[PDB]
Design a protein around this ligand. Structure first.
Ligand code: MG
Ligand code: MG
Ligand code: NA
Lengths: 223, 222
């Protein structure tokens, strides 16, 4: 079926439209993130932003691995494994690089352990775990497609804000760290309208969590 | 905790002792496998042996990935990902190389789909899935240690038998593809209670493999 799907010009057209719908979604093109690109923060504002990011990011590599039990498709497993291998395959791992960045901007492990993140942050982290491990493979692939498309944009915006704050490229290294492979894997799963409905449900449930997350963070840091 | 375990001299001795207990287990050092190393098989014997192996091997990469939800240790996740990346990370995948070997010895997909494997073969495949996804992290790590230690020995014995049958290295390519594991597992074999779960995972895995080769030996015969 994948060998038929990759040959269907309509499937390429559909997934290209979903790329644009994701990138233009308010959860990705968020006012707070665009504001942060040009608005420096004071120490307490910056401490709040990246402490919430820590609880957003925590244990996400383990959540996507829970998708593998729901499929027997090796192209799907390859995409999952490739993403996790990028995060933990070598040293330093991504989470180790993130904790180092936090320490270099005055947010140490001791403060993070005592930090109580927003409920929308807990709902985002738990919501991602639910989408990858407790939903249909088509729905989970929609969330994965949204995650993969968004992540690069989001980190570029935070990289912009940190550069505007005055940090050098070395400090911002964590935020300055396959399209055909991702298209090849997903194509057979967006053929029928029922599969696309599950696919889009996962895309917009994922992005809805991110949007409500950035809404809560925006109020916490303010302006 | 990991640097205390890796610095503990007893943990190195314990896991090295487990290595020997695994390789000397009858599920690994099995009479049928050693017999096959020097005994060629007729077409029906060979078809039965590797058809059971196919249902043994099927979907194992997906099973070990189900271990990752049971831990938040990135060294365990790295070991899981590293193993799966070897099987499906690149093309051709291991299963694709295996299906090609089967076809090259007269076992096509068409026959495999209609093949009903032995019950010990179903129990071995399902048992591995259960051990990696439905057991404690210490127990699943025992199964993972047994699998990683045994697999290299097992494929070498099968490679020997296929070479004895007369197949060349090109055809046997799939069977000729065979500190990080110690670092990952060391914190999980510190106490005797943790070792009890670890050893339970080691010997439950090997018990499944032994009973599998027992059934294959009876199926293949003389
Ligand atoms: Mg600071
Ligand atoms: Mg043959
Ligand atoms: Na051997």
């Amino acid at each position: 079926r994948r060998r038929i799907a990759v040959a269907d010009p309509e499937i390429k057209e559909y997934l290209d439209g979903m790329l644009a719908r994701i990138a233009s979604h308010r959860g990705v093109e968020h006012p707070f993130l665009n504001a942060y690109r040009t608005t420096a923060l004071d120490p307490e504002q910056e401490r709040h932003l990246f402490s919430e990011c820590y609880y957003f990011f925590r244990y996400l590599p383990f959540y996507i691995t829970g998708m593998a039990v729901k499929t027997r498709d090796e192209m799907i497993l390859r995409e999952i494994i490739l993403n996790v291998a990028d995060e933990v395959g070598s040293d330093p791992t991504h989470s180790t690089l993130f904790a180092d960045f936090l320490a270099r901007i005055g947010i140490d492990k001791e403060h993070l352990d005592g930090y109580q993140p927003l409920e929308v942050t807990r709902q985002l982290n738990d919501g991602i775990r639910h989408l990858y491990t407790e939903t249909s493979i088509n729905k989970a692939l929609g969330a994965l497609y949204a995650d993969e498309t968004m992540s690069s944009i989001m980190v570029s915006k935070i990289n912009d804000g940190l550069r505007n704050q005055g940090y050098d490229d070395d400090l911002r290294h964590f935020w300055q760290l396959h399209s055909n492979s991702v298209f090849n894997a997903i194509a057979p799963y967006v053929g029928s309208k029922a599969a696309r409905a599950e696919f889009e449900e996962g895309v917009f449930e994922f992005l809805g969590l991110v949007e409500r997350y950035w809404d809560g963070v925006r109020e916490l840091v303010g302006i």
